[PDB]
């Protein structure tokens with residue numbers, strides 16, 4: 266009945282920088298029913314704020330909460346390595362609780378374009394009845410990047426899966442792997458296998474491809 | 480009987496070397512699992528068996 | 540002080556049901572509601588339901604009504620969650636949470652439902668897959684002066700696999716991606732390494748794959764074609 270929306274999707278922060286996360290409610294609610302949670306990349310969620318502004322026990326002065334009506338904000342100052350993660354606002358009034366979609370806070374750095382590689386299916390895998398084409402996006406920033414598979418220039422959907430590494434603690438870049446799954450029968454009919462990559466660091470979509478055999 | 484034993488597979492391939500295990504009622508069931516595992520990994524060679532250690536081996 | 544203990548991971552065939560147990564340690568048992576929050580892989584927090592034990596005040600999430608049952612065992616001081624007709628959208632980590640409140644509330648006899656959650660259990664991993672334990676098959680990934688090669692560790696169950704390169708001697712430029720669960724119910728991941736293109740004819744690159752649930756230790760040589 267009440268929907269929570271957060272903006273932005275991703276927030277990039279420098280060391281000394283201060284950032285503000287927004288929680289937008291569908292209708293006017295009371296500030297007593299808003300909480301903020303923090304999720305580290307490998308931990309259970311932690312409560313930061315209850316009742317819009319009440320700081321939870323053991324939570325430093327770094328995090329402060331505000332808001333009224335339909336707009337609520339969480340302000341982060343002197344961001345520290347522990348703080349980078351996913352932040353979710355929660356409404357816990359009434360009968361049914363709801364969470365916001367969440368906002369990831371990552372480390373800000375200069376934009377860096379991905380190096381793109383495509384990997385043909387191994388001969389070991391072909392004699393197994395399935396075929397996997399792997400596309401690698403290496404050491405890029407920012408996090409968001411699109412990969413589209415084109416088999417003979419025919420866009421694919423539903424037959425690909427991708428995953429992303431955690432942001433590196435050293436150079437603060439991301440890496441991505443996309444696997445296109447094909448049956449051996451389907452793999453033999455077609456000739457062109459291409460990986461189309463879209464990223465902020467690329468002036469135009471980069472395409473790496475090969476032809477079955479050579 | 481619902482009781483199973485653990486069988487080992489030894490892989491001596493030109494590019495894939497190592498070992499894996501499976502739980503099967505008898506050795507005949509274990510070999511079918513191992514031969515599928517080897518074919519899935521593209522390993523094609525000779526099979527030997529040691530009933531003492533319940534160990535299959537495929538070598539290229 | 541007040542602490543929440545949860546049962547171990549579970550694997551369930553699609554269409555069946557699963558039951559998790561959450562046991563409070565410390566504090567009271569009938570004052571504060573236990574709220575369950577789940578997280579699907581790479582998705583946001585989702586509220587499943589909440590129930591004050593024994594008292595009987597409870598609500599289910601709209602998505603989980605008709606599929607969910609929350610109950611407790613008063614002798615064992617243990618709360619349970621039962622979800623039926625499981626599908627792939629139910630795979631995730633399930634947390635039982637509560638508000639600390641008065642903690643060791645003395646002579647309170649009062650019920651609190653609408654509170655934030657500052658006490659969380661470790662989480663229970665629920666994997667919806669029709670698959671049995673299966674070791675991985677290892678396939679090579681054959682390749683500005685930099686090239687990439689790797690290993691595709693495919694069709695294993697369950698998590699986790701460990702991947703290293705050259706017995707762990709090669710670590711620079713290595714990326715092991717998180718495993719993805721494909722529609723067959725089996726896991727699949729890749730591990731990659733970037734090296735100078737000059738090193739392709741020279742250096743040997745071997746990835747070491749470990750899958751303990753299957754007792755698999757395997758070495759694959761990655762050669763250029």
Ligand SMILES: *[C@@H]1O[C@H](CO)[C@@H](O)[C@H](O)[C@H]1NC(C)=O
Pocket residue numbers: 291292293334335
């Ligand atoms: C919320 O309340 C303010 C002030 O009463 C009003 O101006 C605004 O239109 C209301 N918005 C909603 C979504 O109820």
